[PDB]
Design a protein around this ligand. Structure first.
Ligand code: GHX
Length: 181
């Protein structure tokens, strides 16, 4: 097996989880220790369904930028015995573009799903469903409902979380290492 496949599959095994909130099915990224991230609009509550069980959420932080603008990410601290394999080193210090990225999705409906989204480019400002949002990036692929939280990956890097799409193109909230410090 080659390297990109090995990395993506290992993400699925160790870091990318099927979840369900009152808002539906999402892909969750576990980053390190008991810390994971979801799209804000998933609206995680006091508990969350993760894979085969109900998991209590100890803390939720909805990230905003310096001007108070939505970043569309919620950091959740889980009440679990597992420490996620720490993937912070794979997350760039700054929001970074990529060539020929793969969107990795893991939901009950879309389990272990790999989607070649192509190049990922800087986008910045996006108004999504009436919520102005910052630090987004864009790919020319027609992403669909059910794919939010999907992990944007390229060449051993983990660069965004899928948050929306307009039927022709898809958008992620960009990841930076400091979010998870
Ligand atoms: C995952 O929840 C979902 C994925 C979308 C649906 C169709 N294709 C996709 O990739 N995301 C949404 O439906 C978001 C939800 C949202 C996000 C932030 C605040 C509130 C709600 N909404 C969305 O994608 O609207 C369509 C859109 C997106 C970007 C520009 C124009 C229109």
């Amino acid at each position: 097996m080659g390297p990109s496949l090995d990395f993506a599959l290992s993400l699925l095994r160790r870091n990318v989880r099927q979840v369900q909130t009152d808002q539906g099915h999402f892909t969750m990224l576990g980053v390190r220790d008991r810390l994971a991230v979801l799209p804000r609009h998933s609206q995680p509550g006091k508990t969350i369904w993760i894979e085969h069980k109900l998991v209590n959420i100890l803390d939720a932080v909805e990230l905003v930028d310096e001007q108070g603008v939505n970043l569309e990410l919620t950091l959740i601290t889980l009440d679990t015995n597992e420490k996620f394999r720490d993937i912070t080193k794979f997350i760039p210090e700054n929001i970074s573009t990529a060539s020929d990225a793969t969107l990795v999705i893991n939901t009950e409906h879309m389990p272990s799903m790999f989607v070649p989204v192509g190049d990922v480019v800087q986008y910045g400002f996006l108004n999504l469903s009436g919520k102005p949002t910052h630090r987004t990036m864009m790919y020319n692929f027609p992403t669909k409902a059910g794919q939010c939280g999907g992990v944007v990956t390229s060449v051993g890097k983990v660069i965004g979380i899928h948050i929306g799409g307009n039927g022709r193109q898809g958008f992620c909230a960009g990841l930076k290492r400091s979010y998870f410090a």
